[PDB]
């Protein structure tokens, strides 16, 4: 009886592959061969945010495009001001092993999470100035790799037990689950309209979910190794994925196909961080070669190189208006490119 | 009239840096140790002689250690093992002997030892429950390890009283299995410290402490190297 289900799944995979091939009318390179490119785009370091001891795992620009947050492996959540280079708070984390941070869009809360299988949420706006923990969301059975804020009362978390979750912060209970991934899920990225989202896992696959249902809309495959970081195209009808195969890939939500692939022979390391510019023309990748690249997302040319880090660079970030490019690395040094 | 606001911000930076100095001084006096144990291998019996993560703290020779008993996590470890590349030592507990447990532990060791980020973190190997070997060999491993037939104990053997030479041979055989990987894979940046731990002996703590010494000292001797 199980062989019937295997052959049904094989026939459905064959027909969706046939549909995807039939939708393939041309190549993005074939459509953009007549474009006017921009050449090399050099960038220069502006700041250096020292004060971390251990390696930095995460950073989230604030909606005001001025503040930063950073989680390091020494137990520190440090809330930076990227303009005057001043630390605003130094939250001591109860568990030193955290792999992600998140700055709420209303600036009222900061969420961290890690190997404790618990998402902690600290209330920035307090009566004493010594910011204590507000809510500890527990229930996950695997480590937390990514987490993002929808508002001050709905947070989307990505855990290592292969299930994503949508939590209501005020009551602590998880309102929505997201099952379907076989391996654990590395990175989340909410849609620009916060009605969909997408999650890449360690199966060379990503899944487009609708938060208003809790249901897997679409499933995109085409990578060959674990998918590390994910980021939407600023429009909201595409996104980009960096994976452990040393090759970025730009997917589209409507064509349901791998649309573009960026790679180079000299690259053999993973892709620990991906983000977009304000216009969406530049694709900002952070590799394990201890240097970042910027790609021309329409012509796949290496638009430039961003060096200045010695250890691993493990997180990237572009402001909500596109005036700076902060990086957080494994040598306790945030930096800013402009 | 923004100058006084920047003054307040500078005071809030000053106090935070005065806290971060004390935290940097309490973080360098703390050495972190990742405790990895296998299925039948006694991680918790290495704990006894001394959520998704558990924390044990050590005060020895007026020095503070941290041991991370990584518990209720996922079985596939290729994504959370990269967190522990800054710890001083990976305390690697192994069994000594129903599936192929020794080969599983040896393949886990070969995997960890060859990682791109763990190529600097040293390992401290333990071979637990040698009493199990002493009561199982005197009362079979050739099917899982044929070389055990054509193996003889080295001259460097340190046989404690009461152990049959066959059990000692099996013990040092497993030790040499691990040490072949230890020597062949790396390139002189980390070192495995085998330690034939018993069922219960508190001396294990010292065997940690002293070995951490060797892990630190040689790192200091990386600056003074030439050519």
């Amino acid at each position, epitope marked *: 009886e199980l062989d019937q289900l295997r052959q049904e799944a094989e026939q459905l995979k064959n027909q969706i592959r046939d549909a995807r091939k039939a939708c393939a009318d041309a190549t993005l390179s074939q459509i953009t061969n007549n474009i006017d490119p921009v050449g090399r785009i050099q960038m220069r370091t502006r700041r250096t945010l020292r004060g971390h001891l251990a390696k930095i795992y995460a950073m989230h620009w604030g909606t005001d495009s001025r503040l930063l947050v950073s989680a390091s492996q020494d137990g520190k959540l440090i809330i930076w001001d990227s303009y005057t280079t001043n630390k605003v708070h130094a939250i001591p984390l109860r568990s030193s092993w955290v792999m992600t941070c998140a700055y709420a869009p209303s600036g009222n809360y900061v969420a961290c999470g890690g190997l404790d299988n618990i998402c902690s949420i600290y209330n920035l706006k307090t009566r004493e100035g010594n910011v204590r923990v507000s809510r500890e969301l527990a229930g996950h059975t695997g480590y937390l790799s990514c987490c993002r804020f929808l508002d001050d009362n709905q947070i989307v978390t990505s855990s290592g037990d292969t299930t994503c979750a949508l939590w209501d912060i005020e009551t602590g209970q998880q309102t929505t689950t997201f099952t379907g991934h076989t391996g654990d899920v590395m990175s989340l990225s909410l849609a620009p309209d916060t009605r969909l989202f997408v999650s890449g896992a360690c199966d060379a696959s990503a899944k487009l979910w609708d938060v208003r249902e809790g249901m897997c809309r679409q499933t995109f495959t085409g990578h*060959e190794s*674990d998918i590390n970081a994910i980021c939407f195209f600023p429009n909201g009808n595409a996104f980009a994925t960096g994976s452990d195969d040393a090759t970025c890939r730009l997917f589209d939500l409507r064509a349901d196909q791998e649309l573009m692939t960026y790679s180079h022979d000299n690259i053999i390391c993973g892709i620990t961080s991906v983000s977009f510019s304000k216009s969406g023309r530049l694709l900002l990748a952070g590799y394990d070669d201890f240097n970042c690249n910027v790609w021309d997302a329409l012509k796949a040319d290496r638009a430039g190189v961003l060096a200045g880090h010695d250890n691993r660079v493990s997180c990237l970030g572009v402001t909500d208006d596109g005036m700076a490019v902060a990086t957080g690395s494994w040598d306790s040094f945030l930096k800013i490119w402009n | 009239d923004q100058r006084n606001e920047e003054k307040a911000q500078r005071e809030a930076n000053k106090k935070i840096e005065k806290q971060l100095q004390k935290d940097k001084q309490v973080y360098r006096a703390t050495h972190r140790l990742l405790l990895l144990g296998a299925g039948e291998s006694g991680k918790n019996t290495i704990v006894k002689q001394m959520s998704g993560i558990f924390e044990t703290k050590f005060q020895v020779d007026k020095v503070n250690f941290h041991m991370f008993d990584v518990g209720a996590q996922r*079985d596939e470890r290729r994504k959370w093992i990269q967190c522990f590349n800054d710890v001083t030592a990976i305390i690697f507990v192994v069994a000594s002997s129903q*599936t192929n447990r020794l080969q599983a532990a040896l393949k886990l060791f070969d995997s960890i030892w060859n990682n791109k980020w763990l190529r600097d973190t040293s390992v401290i190997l333990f071979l637990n429950k040698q009493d199990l070997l002493a009561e199982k060999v005197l009362a079979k491993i050739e099917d899982y390890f044929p070389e055990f037939a054509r193996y003889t104990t080295p001259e460097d053997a340190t046989p404690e009283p009461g152990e049959d030479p066959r059990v000692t041979r099996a013990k040092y055989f497993i030790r040499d299995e691990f040490l072949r990987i230890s020597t062949a894979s790396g390139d002189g940046r980390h070192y495995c410290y085998p330690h034939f731990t018993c069922a219960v002996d508190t001396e294990n703590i010292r065997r940690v402490f002293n070995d951490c010494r060797d892990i630190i000292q040689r790192m200091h001797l990386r600056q003074y190297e030439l050519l």
Partner: nanobody
Amino acid sequence: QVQLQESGGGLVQPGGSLRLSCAASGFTFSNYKMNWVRQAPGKGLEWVSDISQSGASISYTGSVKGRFTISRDNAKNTLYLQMNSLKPEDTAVYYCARCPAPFTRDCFDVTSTTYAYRGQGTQVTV
């Protein structure tokens, strides 16, 4: 996608000599180490054999040293396990697993929980 399919299993008398082939499509075969593992009915997953990017670093478990043999081809992207001088211990389903990264020496692909790049297997019995 990634596809790891197998062919050659079944039932053979004690002392037979089988050859399980594994076709690996979807990815680049010239970059990933390739493993062969087994699953016994009353036992968990066990590792059987390995082979490197060029095939130089062959390995075996103690119960198959000399008996089995691993091989692979790059023009056809195929992975064979030629099993010689079998025995009733060989009754197991053989999976054709893939190392989770390119240009790496180490792999974690013997996971009881569903490993991503692991084939569906072929059952051999004696």
